[PDB]
Amino acid sequence: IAAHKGVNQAPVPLKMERVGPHDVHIEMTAQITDIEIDKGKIYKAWTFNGQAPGPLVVVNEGDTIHFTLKNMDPVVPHSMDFHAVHASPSKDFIDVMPNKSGTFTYPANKPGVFMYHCGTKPVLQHIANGMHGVIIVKPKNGYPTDKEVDREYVLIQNEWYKYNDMNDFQNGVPSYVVFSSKALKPGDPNTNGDTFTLKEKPLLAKVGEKIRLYINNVGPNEVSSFHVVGTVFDDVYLDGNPNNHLQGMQTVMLPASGGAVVEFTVTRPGTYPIVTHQFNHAQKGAVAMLKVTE
Amino acid sequence: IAAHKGVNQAPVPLKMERVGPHDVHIEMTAQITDIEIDKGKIYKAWTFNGQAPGPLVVVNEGDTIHFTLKNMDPVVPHSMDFHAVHASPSKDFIDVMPNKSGTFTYPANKPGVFMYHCGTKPVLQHIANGMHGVIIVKPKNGYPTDKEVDREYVLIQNEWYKYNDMNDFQNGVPSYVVFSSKALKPGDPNTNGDTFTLKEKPLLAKVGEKIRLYINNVGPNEVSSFHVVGTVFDDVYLDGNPNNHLQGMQTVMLPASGGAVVEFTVTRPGTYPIVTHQFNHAQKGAVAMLKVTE
Amino acid sequence: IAAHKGVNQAPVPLKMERVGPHDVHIEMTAQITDIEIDKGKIYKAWTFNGQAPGPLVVVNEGDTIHFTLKNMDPVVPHSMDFHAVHASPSKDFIDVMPNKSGTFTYPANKPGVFMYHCGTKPVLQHIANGMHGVIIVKPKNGYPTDKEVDREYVLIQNEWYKYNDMNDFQNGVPSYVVFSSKALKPGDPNTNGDTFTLKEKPLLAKVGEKIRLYINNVGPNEVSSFHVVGTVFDDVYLDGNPNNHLQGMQTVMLPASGGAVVEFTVTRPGTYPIVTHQFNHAQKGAVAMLKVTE
Numbered sequence: 097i098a099a100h101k102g103v104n105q106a107p108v109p110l111k112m113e114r115v116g117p118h119d120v121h122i123e124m125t126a127q128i129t130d131i132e133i134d135k136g137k138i139y140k141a142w143t144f145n146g147q148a149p150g151p152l153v154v155v156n157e158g159d160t161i162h163f164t165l166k167n168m169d170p171v172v173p174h175s176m177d178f179h180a181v182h183a184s185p186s187k188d189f190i191d192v193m194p195n196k197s198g199t200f201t202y203p204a205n206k207p208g209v210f211m212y213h214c215g216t217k218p219v220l221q222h223i224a225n226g227m228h229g230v231i232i233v234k235p236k237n238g239y240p241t242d243k244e245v246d247r248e249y250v251l252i253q254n255e256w257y258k259y260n261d262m263n264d265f266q267n268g269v270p271s272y273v274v275f276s277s278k279a280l281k282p283g284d285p286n287t288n289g290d291t292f293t294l295k296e297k298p299l300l301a302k303v304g305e306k307i308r309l310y311i312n313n314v315g316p317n318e319v320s321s322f323h324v325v326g327t328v329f330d331d332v333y334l335d336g337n338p339n340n341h342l343q344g345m346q347t348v349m350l351p352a353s354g355g356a357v358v359e360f361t362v363t364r365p366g367t368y369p370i371v372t373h374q375f376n377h378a379q380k381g382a383v384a385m386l387k388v389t390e
Numbered sequence: 391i392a393a394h395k396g397v398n399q400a401p402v403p404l405k406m407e408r409v410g411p412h413d414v415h416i417e418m419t420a421q422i423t424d425i426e427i428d429k430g431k432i433y434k435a436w437t438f439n440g441q442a443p444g445p446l447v448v449v450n451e452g453d454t455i456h457f458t459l460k461n462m463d464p465v466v467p468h469s470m471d472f473h474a475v476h477a478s479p480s481k482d483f484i485d486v487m488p489n490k491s492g493t494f495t496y497p498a499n500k501p502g503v504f505m506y507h508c509g510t511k512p513v514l515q516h517i518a519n520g521m522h523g524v525i526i527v528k529p530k531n532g533y534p535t536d537k538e539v540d541r542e543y544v545l546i547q548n549e550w551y552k553y554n555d556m557n558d559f560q561n562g563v564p565s566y567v568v569f570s571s572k573a574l575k576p577g578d579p580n581t582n583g584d585t586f587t588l589k590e591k592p593l594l595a596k597v598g599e600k601i602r603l604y605i606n607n608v609g610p611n612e613v614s615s616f617h618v619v620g621t622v623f624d625d626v627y628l629d630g631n632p633n634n635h636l637q638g639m640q641t642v643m644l645p646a647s648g649g650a651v652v653e654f655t656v657t658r659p660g661t662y663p664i665v666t667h668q669f670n671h672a673q674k675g676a677v678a679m680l681k682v683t684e
Numbered sequence: 685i686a687a688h689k690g691v692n693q694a695p696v697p698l699k700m701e702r703v704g705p706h707d708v709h710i711e712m713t714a715q716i717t718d719i720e721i722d723k724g725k726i727y728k729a730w731t732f733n734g735q736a737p738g739p740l741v742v743v744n745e746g747d748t749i750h751f752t753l754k755n756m757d758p759v760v761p762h763s764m765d766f767h768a769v770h771a772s773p774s775k776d777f778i779d780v781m782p783n784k785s786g787t788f789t790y791p792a793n794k795p796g797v798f799m800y801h802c803g804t805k806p807v808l809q810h811i812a813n814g815m816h817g818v819i820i821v822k823p824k825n826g827y828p829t830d831k832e833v834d835r836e837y838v839l840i841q842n843e844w845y846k847y848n849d850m851n852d853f854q855n856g857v858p859s860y861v862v863f864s865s866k867a868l869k870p871g872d873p874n875t876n877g878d879t880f881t882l883k884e885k886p887l888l889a890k891v892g893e894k895i896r897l898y899i900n901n902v903g904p905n906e907v908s909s910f911h912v913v914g915t916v917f918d919d920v921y922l923d924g925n926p927n928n929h930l931q932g933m934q935t936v937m938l939p940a941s942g943g944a945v946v947e948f949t950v951t952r953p954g955t956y957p958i959v960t961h962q963f964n965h966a967q968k969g970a971v972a973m974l975k976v977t978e
């Protein structure tokens with residue numbers, strides 16, 4: 097797209113503020129940003145806020161979101177679909193033209209770990225180019241295992257294909273499959289989907305801790321067989337809904353857009369790989385590390 | 391197959407009748423029928439009754455089915471395998487030769503949303519050519535959320551490949567992935583697996599209603615990440631067994647042959663896409679619409 | 685690998701012995717062994733003990749395993765990762781060089797049907813070449829349906845690719861997808877992953893019996909849609925954890941590395957195919973048989 101040649105829009109911070117006990121404002125951008133997805137490989141991604149996946153959003157169960165999208169893309173319209181919300185797609189997930197803004201309001205009544213993504217036709221194109229992310233909705237009533245959790249992180253899985261190539265998007269294997277981490281608390285890492293960052297800079301934890309991971313496989317196209325090497329999931333909440341409780345899972349199957357809350361104990365010092373156990377995907381990038389110290 | 395050149399057998403209605411408090415007769419055909427699977431694209435399908443997927447069958451838990459297959463295919467044998475039933479495959483799912491009939495009897499003791507399909511070797515060929523469908527077995531004891539359901543429909547997902555091409559069937563990506571709807575009550579639509587009908591003629595509902603969808607992914611080869619845009623599933627019953635209860639799912643993973651009952655509320659007027667969230671499949675047809683009016 | 689030309693190391697029996705009420709010794713080899721994976725097709729597999737999948741391991745919940753690996757491969761290092769255990773991957777799943785041994789100790793505190801596999805980089809290569817298997821951890825407290833089970837077997841699903849071809853491993857469809865059975869009691873079959881043995885020599889059962897299958901899909905790359913033709917699963921325990929209970933499932937979705945305990949009744953004499961319902965995989969080998977006699 098001629099109007100994207102040479103474009104590299106610097107990342108813009110997410111903006112959120114609470115405006116009532118059950119109402120939260122969120123402002124995001126759609127913007128075109130170069131991201132290094134593998135060593136030596138730049139992808140001129142379509143993004144929210146200059147990150148792919150996009151910035152993490154966290155709200156409380158029962159919050160109504162008053163969402164603004166500022167479209168900085170000079171030529172392509174963009175939109176927002178939060179899986180967390182109840183909304184009319186044809187009224188509330190509609191396009192925002194280049195250099196314009198739109199505001200949409202809708203409730204997040206269900207706890208969990210939801211995908212968000214651009215909803216502009218062709219949606220495959222917009223997602224595959226990088227317009228995906230996660231919104232976490234915290235349960236009013238928490239999770240039954242909250243008291244045991246010692247540390248937590250967010251991990252997102254996505255694929256990368258040949259750049260902006262609809263034939264490949266539809267018909268081809270992924271070039272890369274990758275994890276990223278999005279920060280929940282100051283000091284947490286905040287990374288993009290790439291083959292290397294979470295190997296070079298592992299997530300951190302201490303011996304004996306119970307770790308919670310909030311996870312989502314945003315696709316676009318693949319399912320995920322999520323596994324932490326050297327442990328077993330004590331507890332799993334499918335989609336992050338506290339009612340959807342499994343125990344003692346080795347591996348969690350995630351559909352495309354599928355989420356979970358998973359919890360596990362790291363018993364010994366060392367480095368613990370985190371994979372999709374579809375090992376072709378692991379080999380093309382989808383291995384993160386968790387470094388556990390005494 | 392030379393004996394299928396020029397063959398286009400008109401659709402024949404399903405025949406069912408109850409013959410006892412726990413016994414039901416069902417008669418189907420195997421027949422060769424041209425179906426438009428994408429605009430401008432005819433597939434000379436192998437079918438039950440001239441539909442692909444085949445006609446919907448609904449029985450009650452505990453019914454014994456006395457099933458007759460009339461094979462109208464002039465040259466290929468066909469058979470029937472209902473996932474709902476307990477049967478000896480080598481006695482009860484056996485071939486019916488061209489221009490012959492066979493009758494088989496077996497019980498449906500388990501509630502749910504089951505695949506049915508031809509079972510003739512190579513089964514991949516028979517399924518991929520269109521010999522698939524759904525049988526719903528209604529639970530004696532209903533579902534706990536029956537009182538809240540305002541409207542219901544059946545949706546089936548299948549793939550289409552290059553015509554009658556075993557290499558493609560085994561090794562290739564699907565050409566199309568599609569939804570169809572099969573009628574439960576007079577006035578409901580009854581469609582075949584194609585890329586366009588349920589976009590052109592959306593399923594209908596009213597604002598505020600809780601909708602139930604009976605769903606099955608018949609494959610042949612792909613899994614499905616089933617999602618309704620703009621809502622969250624309040625309740626999910628995996629395989630349609632009332633005991634297999636999930637809540638607050640964004641997306642339901644379905645294996646090949648996998649079913650579910652899913653329920654969700656449409657809160658606002660508008661059009662709600664229904665997808666597999668494996669967006670390569672969505673892009674090659676697997677988007678249906680639900681139009682919600684005041 | 686020049687040092688593997690002409691190498692065909694005879695299978696070596698697994699060695700296990702209990703050394704305390706909660707401690708068990710296990711010794712395995714890594715070795716290079718020719719296996720006929722399809723009629724006329726030899727694969728010079730990388731194996732544990734000359735089987736692919738490897739030998740079955742069964743321990744009790746709460747057992748600590750003191751595991752020795754003897755690496756007989758003349759040139760490639762190998763390792764062991766049991767999904768059953770809690771361990772430091774970087775200390776306990778480390779490489780054993782050619783012609784050396786290593787011993788590692790770790791607990792199996794969680795009941796279920798776990799994958800084990802080589803953990804040497806590239807792990808895709810080691811798994812795809814055949815270094816996979818199952819460890820069953822028996823629950824202290826059994827399964828609630830134990831009293832109804834009349835007969836049981838272990839089945840494992842894996843894929844085979846072009847020999848030792850990392851491009852194919854990462855990017856290609858599987859050449860074959862296969863079941864094997866691993867013996868639990870004297871007289872049970874013990875087979876390798878191939879397209880034909882469990883068709884030629886079906887698993888055996890008697891009319892009316894409730895059968896339990898312990899199942900795992902070791903991949904490397906595919907998910908599985910596990911189904912027994914002519915029955916419905918009465919009970920399913922995901923990953924073999926008794927708490928993860930489903931009922932009345934037609935088909936069980938298994939991630940890569942995913943396990944289950946599944947139980948079903950065979951009501952009539954005959955032969956019952958056992959498939960992955962991803963029928964492209966079934967067609968490339970993944971059909972086993974269960975012969976049921978009066």
Ligand SMILES: [Cl-]
Nearest residue numbers: 157235236237
């Ligand atoms: Cl409440």
Ligand SMILES: [Cl-]
Nearest residue numbers: 323325371765
């Ligand atoms: Cl692993």
Ligand SMILES: [Cl-]
Nearest residue numbers: 451529530531
């Ligand atoms: Cl009852």
Ligand SMILES: [Cl-]
Nearest residue numbers: 177617619665
């Ligand atoms: Cl969507």
Ligand SMILES: [Cl-]
Nearest residue numbers: 745823824825
């Ligand atoms: Cl206990």
Ligand SMILES: [Cl-]
Nearest residue numbers: 471911913959
């Ligand atoms: Cl089948």
Ligand SMILES: [Cu+2]
Nearest residue numbers: 116117118158
């Ligand atoms: Cu309040």
Ligand SMILES: [Cu+2]
Nearest residue numbers: 116118119160
């Ligand atoms: Cu308000």
Ligand SMILES: [Cu+2]
Nearest residue numbers: 116118119160
């Ligand atoms: Cu308000």
Ligand SMILES: [Cu+2]
Nearest residue numbers: 134135136137
């Ligand atoms: Cu690279």
Ligand SMILES: [Cu+2]
Nearest residue numbers: 115120121162
């Ligand atoms: Cu506002």
Ligand SMILES: [Cu+2]
Nearest residue numbers: 174175214222
């Ligand atoms: Cu967009």
Ligand SMILES: [Cu+2]
Nearest residue numbers: 177179213353
């Ligand atoms: Cu979506």
Ligand SMILES: [Cu+2]
Nearest residue numbers: 157207236237
């Ligand atoms: Cu609540």
Ligand SMILES: [Cu+2]
Nearest residue numbers: 246247302305
């Ligand atoms: Cu701590």
Ligand SMILES: [Cu+2]
Nearest residue numbers: 245248280308
């Ligand atoms: Cu927290």
